[PDB]
């Protein structure tokens, strides 16, 4: 519970913002058939033009203001097209002699907007929200979106709107003011109303994980991260259990303890549990890789391209699991029992660190010959998977920033999923569709299994013959799940938004949608 | 065409073996239910032990020789185990005092063998054949196989048994092969299909394994003409003067630095009846990829292997043999490959050069080693003009496949899910594994060139297999198209030889669609 | 024995050593060929060659005491098999008593005189027939002509490759070992004094291989010195393990600086074998004992550095300990042998020694460290000063010193340096009788000027010469002033990369050198 320090100025906790400005926004959804009242703030129309490649703009909603209706006439919009991401600002006075602001965001000519397209639409909306001091934003949906896409629009709006300033001191944004009300006019408004407070819950779960990842490793360490998870479980009223070094020694978690041997922070295993009111028909263990910093060990990240400065994000899988724990603990699904697990530690260089070539013993008795200390994620997950299978669950899903090879296979957009069971993978892909967090199915090639045969240990940690590390790492994790249906999501390439210089919070919505639809 | 030479000792043709000793093997299939005759040659039992990992060997078939029957008793075969790939074989005299050999190959403890497991079993069998002088081999299947897999057994056995000694200056080849297997009467029909599939793979391997001084754009097209004349295929070889006038500037820019002129191969198989499906198979034909001015100099570039950059074209030519031999129904197949050589010279195309494809698109060259997609783009514009229903291209395009799927599974991309599913189905029946990878449209923006219509490569998205597929997709406008990247699976690094990957996949695609 | 420090309770506190291997249970019986062969139970293998004829026909030239087996092995049936080096075939037949027997052969090529490498190729084929078969006896018939050293080498290599180290397997395992070994050879009475010599030389190589293959979390300075104490106790050898407090009093600043960054205290191993009859020969054997070489702040980060193999940087120490077993068992006389090793671990830490640090050796020489990964010559320097103070006649050190050996002699031959005719020639002669190949390499004095330090007495590394193995010998030569000294660089030959296992190189070479003086 107590965070060790080198100097008295070292932080002793991760700062977390629970009551964000988003939570103060009053959201109201109105029916488009009754017309829109433009009154104050900024009113944005989501306009399309099917067939016409960036064709002209046409406002097709009844506006309850004569002055603003005259401005939005078709003959006045020669000059704006529906090109995806394009936006314009208009200034005028309404019927009550009051100054109002109206605009639009182009949504292209494809009637069905993709997940990446909708993100581009939302980003244009946020640019109009920044550098402006508005009190209400009003969005008029002149496009077709299902209930999932409408919720995805809200989550992305909330997530991109918020600015994380926990670590600013002499450089906070002085011109930063958030709107207090959000009005939405949409076709068949009553069916979308229920998605609003689900989107806000999905927003914070994603933002909570982003807060943990963006926190650097001197703030986010094994002790302070598990302390925050306890704090989260107490606010939600979940059962919680943090396993210390002495308990992990008795469980013979040799692979997990060997990774964190060289750290000044003791290993901390997070075990949160949400149980249902009523009978349970699904037991699920969610495992997240929790490496608060990955220096690589004695296989140090020194080669060009290793991005050693970004390795604070090697606990992104753990953050996604904890972010889901908030969503599950808040929405309270039932007929289900969920275990949120993470073997948290730090991979450091020290005189106490574990070495390349060392042979360690996992909690299931298997001996492993270490070939690369930078492949430490699969070592900690192995003991976490054995711990998860002892829980007697139906599905085991692990999520981890495991292999940089994911960048060269799927890139920065789609995550990769591996597994030993087909229906679980299909359930993961279905959750990917409804959560709009894209994931692609990749194979576990058994022909590569022979390259993990160690001359002395039961199994090798790495191959060093096969260059397909994402597949080889799944071969290794498969060796520690004997009978339970298990899936593995590699988020090493998609977790960090390199262009936006901030985390994505990837996995929170995907895991929760998987929990909510089973 | 005449092959240019620098010195008179440079070869002027690719030596090709059509008349392999495999074609002399008499193949016989018999039913296992009736017992085995083990009196001539070498008899190998394919045995497993379900449940008991590394369990003992137990033969359950009645043999006719009393001496061999005494050897096969359980007290003598429990001293051997069934570990996948393990093998033992002994020499003895039969009841008539004739020389025979009996042995086994372990098939593990999993009743269902994958293609990789069967490859390891065949490898053990072939090792015994390279040390054997007996003229007969009998293989007894005490395991469960369909003959998508048993045809795979024959195909792989034929391919690994054959040894390429064309460049060379303790074993004889068997004259008979006996097979004891359940339901042999059904199991006859794949024998001659395996022999056709074997040679198409072996013929393609011969072109790939042929070094670049032997296999050049001129000699490779000459071999394609010779193959089309023996098969009775329509053939057309396009020269530089004709390629310039089809305005195939991307393809011609790749080969400028070569001493060999560009040669475009176009073979055609037409049906005797009416045509109900038109298919175009496009193959990347880089007989040597030095990388150009982006020279393959970094560690790992494998410049010494780069004669294999025409493996996609070899797979198309290998499929042309199988299609031309089995002569399928109601189909019209076009076999295309834009063959050239990527060299360093005063005449080479440069990094930063802007070239014009045959469809009018301007391309900004970012790396000369990404030359495959440049030739494929002009070949794809040529293929769509043929008015086909499906366009399938196969290419050793991007080394990123070694970090994605590795050296076992190839990746397939496409713009049409029905064609992709048809390729995936062909992967199962041909037993050449392929995995479907996505065309991520979010990466399309990184191909936007500031000056040209499109960038050849991306500068930010470090995932070339998806980016290269996004580039090729812009050169197929209306036809359902798929792209198979075989850069990782083309060369067998452990065996120091090509695999001939793609030949059986393409043939099964045309023979079953 | 000291207590091994641990970070977590799951850290191992001792190296597992197998002393009673299945090889020790094999009853070995040798017969003379001029009396006929009796084809018994199990497997009977003939070693056949054909001088002059490359891949010539197989011809069995030994009397078999079985009419049926002699008919099988007639010339008109061996015919279809050839003698290519490494080829093997299996035969199944029934003998005169209506019993089924197993017979075969391994081809030994032409050449007639087989090299150590060629014999290993023959032995490997022999082990393949021993593997995956459940035989109780193997019989070997020598129809190839071999001397006593090559016959002993055949048994040593066969025992070593047949043995399988499963100390670190848990869930993994499989099948058994034969209980009897028969050998038929001409003039058999002369060859069989080598049988029990081969069994002794085998375990010394396997014991060294056990220590090398043991990883660094198992094999560290504390646990490695404890094993030497345990070995000395079983062999009744005098032993002394020097701790940091004693090494500080001996002013071993070069040796102490290397181990500063380790969690394991430095341990100097000093074993002694003394003869009963008056001692007319005094020998000190020094082995490099770096249980793990991270390289220090000059971290092994380049692609070729092979840091995951650096548990083998104590191969020199294991070779000396393997010699201690062989010498301690056969008990030669008129010799004192000192088995020395300055054991430590080269790690990265806040306590590690830095590139550029100037340290003082136990002989007063100051050294400027130019690269922390050149820690071998620093630990050896203090060990040689310690060795010379013992008043010995010969000092021989063995070390996995420089990776440059992979670019000079490769993976087959080790390099020997020295300051004296006969110690080098006696070592080179021992290489011939031990069949462990070593090549004599020069100490080029022209390179000595490149070790001139601007501030310290001598530089640890050169600033211009890329011949690291020769420069290291020049550095080590500076710490032996009056005694005959030789240096064996085994950095290229210690690990069998293809077989992913140690070779135990040096045990038989060092032991033969002690036994032939
Ligand atoms: Zn790592
Ligand atoms: Zn990591
Ligand atoms: Zn290229
Ligand atoms: Zn290429
Ligand atoms: Zn070193
Ligand atoms: Zn060293």
Coordinates of N, CA and C in Angstrom, one line a residue, chain A residues 59-126:
Chain A
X59 N -29.5 21.9 -46.0 CA -30.2 21.7 -44.6 C -31.6 21.3 -44.8
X60 N -31.9 20.1 -44.3 CA -33.2 19.4 -44.6 C -34.1 19.3 -43.3
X61 N -33.8 20.1 -42.3 CA -34.5 20.0 -41.0 C -35.4 21.3 -40.9
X62 N -36.6 21.2 -40.4 CA -37.4 22.3 -40.1 C -36.8 23.1 -39.0
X63 N -36.4 24.4 -39.2 CA -35.9 25.2 -38.2 C -37.0 26.2 -37.7
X64 N -37.2 26.3 -36.4 CA -38.3 27.1 -35.8 C -37.9 28.5 -35.7
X65 N -37.1 29.1 -36.6 CA -36.7 30.5 -36.6 C -36.7 31.0 -38.0
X66 N -37.5 32.1 -38.2 CA -37.6 32.6 -39.6 C -36.3 33.2 -40.1
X67 N -35.6 33.9 -39.2 CA -34.3 34.5 -39.6 C -33.3 33.4 -39.9
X68 N -33.1 32.4 -39.1 CA -32.1 31.3 -39.3 C -32.6 30.4 -40.5
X69 N -33.9 30.3 -40.7 CA -34.3 29.5 -41.8 C -34.0 30.3 -43.2
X70 N -34.0 31.6 -43.1 CA -33.7 32.4 -44.3 C -32.2 32.2 -44.6
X71 N -31.4 32.2 -43.6 CA -29.9 32.0 -43.8 C -29.6 30.7 -44.4
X72 N -30.3 29.6 -43.9 CA -30.0 28.3 -44.3 C -30.7 27.8 -45.5
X73 N -31.2 28.8 -46.3 CA -31.9 28.4 -47.6 C -30.8 27.8 -48.5
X74 N -31.4 27.0 -49.5 CA -30.5 26.3 -50.4 C -29.7 27.3 -51.3
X75 N -30.3 28.4 -51.7 CA -29.6 29.3 -52.6 C -28.4 30.0 -51.9
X76 N -28.4 30.0 -50.5 CA -27.3 30.6 -49.8 C -26.1 29.7 -49.6
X77 N -26.3 28.4 -49.8 CA -25.2 27.4 -49.6 C -24.7 26.9 -51.0
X78 N -24.2 27.8 -51.8 CA -23.5 27.4 -53.0 C -22.1 26.8 -52.7
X79 N -21.5 27.3 -51.6 CA -20.1 27.4 -51.4 C -19.5 26.3 -50.5
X80 N -20.4 25.5 -49.8 CA -19.9 24.5 -48.9 C -20.3 23.1 -49.4
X81 N -19.4 22.2 -49.4 CA -19.7 20.8 -49.8 C -19.6 19.9 -48.6
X82 N -19.9 18.7 -48.8 CA -20.1 17.7 -47.7 C -18.8 16.9 -47.5
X83 N -17.7 17.3 -48.0 CA -16.4 16.6 -47.9 C -16.2 16.2 -46.5
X84 N -15.8 14.9 -46.3 CA -15.7 14.4 -44.9 C -14.7 15.2 -44.1
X85 N -15.2 15.8 -43.0 CA -14.3 16.6 -42.1 C -14.5 18.1 -42.3
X86 N -15.0 18.6 -43.4 CA -15.2 20.0 -43.7 C -16.2 20.6 -42.7
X87 N -15.9 21.8 -42.3 CA -16.8 22.5 -41.3 C -16.8 24.0 -41.6
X88 N -17.9 24.6 -41.3 CA -18.0 26.1 -41.5 C -18.8 26.7 -40.4
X89 N -18.5 28.0 -40.1 CA -19.1 28.7 -39.0 C -20.0 29.8 -39.7
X90 N -21.2 30.0 -39.2 CA -22.1 31.1 -39.6 C -22.5 31.9 -38.4
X91 N -22.7 33.2 -38.6 CA -23.1 34.2 -37.6 C -24.4 34.9 -38.1
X92 N -25.3 35.0 -37.2 CA -26.6 35.6 -37.6 C -27.4 36.0 -36.3
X93 N -28.5 36.7 -36.5 CA -29.4 37.0 -35.5 C -30.7 36.3 -35.7
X94 N -31.4 35.8 -34.6 CA -32.6 35.1 -34.8 C -33.8 36.0 -34.7
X95 N -35.0 35.4 -34.6 CA -36.2 36.2 -34.6 C -36.3 37.1 -33.4
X96 N -35.7 36.7 -32.3 CA -35.8 37.5 -31.0 C -34.7 38.5 -31.0
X97 N -34.1 38.9 -32.1 CA -33.0 39.8 -32.2 C -31.8 39.4 -31.3
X98 N -31.6 38.1 -31.2 CA -30.5 37.5 -30.5 C -29.4 36.9 -31.4
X99 N -28.2 37.1 -31.1 CA -27.1 36.6 -31.9 C -26.9 35.1 -31.7
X100 N -26.8 34.3 -32.7 CA -26.7 32.9 -32.6 C -25.6 32.5 -33.6
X101 N -25.0 31.3 -33.3 CA -24.0 30.7 -34.1 C -24.5 29.3 -34.7
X102 N -24.4 29.2 -36.0 CA -24.8 28.0 -36.7 C -23.7 27.5 -37.6
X103 N -23.6 26.2 -37.8 CA -22.6 25.6 -38.7 C -23.0 24.2 -39.1
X104 N -22.1 23.6 -39.8 CA -22.2 22.2 -40.3 C -20.9 21.5 -40.3
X105 N -21.0 20.2 -40.3 CA -19.8 19.3 -40.5 C -20.1 18.4 -41.6
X106 N -19.3 18.4 -42.7 CA -19.5 17.5 -43.8 C -19.3 16.0 -43.4
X107 N -20.2 15.2 -43.8 CA -20.1 13.7 -43.5 C -20.0 12.9 -44.8
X108 N -19.5 13.5 -45.9 CA -19.2 12.7 -47.1 C -20.4 12.4 -47.9
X109 N -20.2 11.4 -48.8 CA -21.3 11.0 -49.7 C -21.6 9.5 -49.5
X110 N -21.1 8.9 -48.5 CA -21.3 7.4 -48.2 C -22.3 7.4 -47.0
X111 N -23.5 6.9 -47.4 CA -24.6 6.9 -46.4 C -24.3 6.2 -45.1
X112 N -23.5 5.2 -45.2 CA -23.0 4.4 -44.0 C -21.6 4.9 -43.6
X113 N -21.5 5.6 -42.5 CA -20.2 6.1 -42.0 C -19.5 5.0 -41.3
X114 N -18.2 4.9 -41.6 CA -17.3 3.9 -40.9 C -16.9 4.4 -39.5
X115 N -16.3 3.5 -38.8 CA -15.8 4.0 -37.5 C -14.7 5.0 -37.6
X116 N -13.8 4.9 -38.6 CA -12.8 5.9 -38.8 C -13.4 7.2 -39.4
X117 N -14.4 7.0 -40.2 CA -15.1 8.2 -40.7 C -15.8 9.0 -39.6
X118 N -16.5 8.3 -38.7 CA -17.2 9.0 -37.7 C -16.2 9.7 -36.7
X119 N -15.0 9.1 -36.5 CA -14.0 9.8 -35.7 C -13.6 11.1 -36.4
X120 N -13.4 11.0 -37.7 CA -13.0 12.3 -38.4 C -14.1 13.3 -38.3
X121 N -15.4 12.9 -38.3 CA -16.5 13.8 -38.1 C -16.4 14.5 -36.8
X122 N -16.2 13.7 -35.7 CA -16.2 14.2 -34.4 C -15.0 15.1 -34.2
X123 N -13.9 14.8 -34.7 CA -12.7 15.7 -34.6 C -13.0 17.0 -35.1
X124 N -13.7 17.1 -36.3 CA -14.0 18.4 -36.8 C -15.0 19.2 -35.9
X125 N -15.8 18.5 -35.2 CA -16.7 19.1 -34.2 C -16.0 19.7 -33.0
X126 N -14.9 18.9 -32.6 CA -14.2 19.4 -31.4 C -13.3 20.6 -31.8

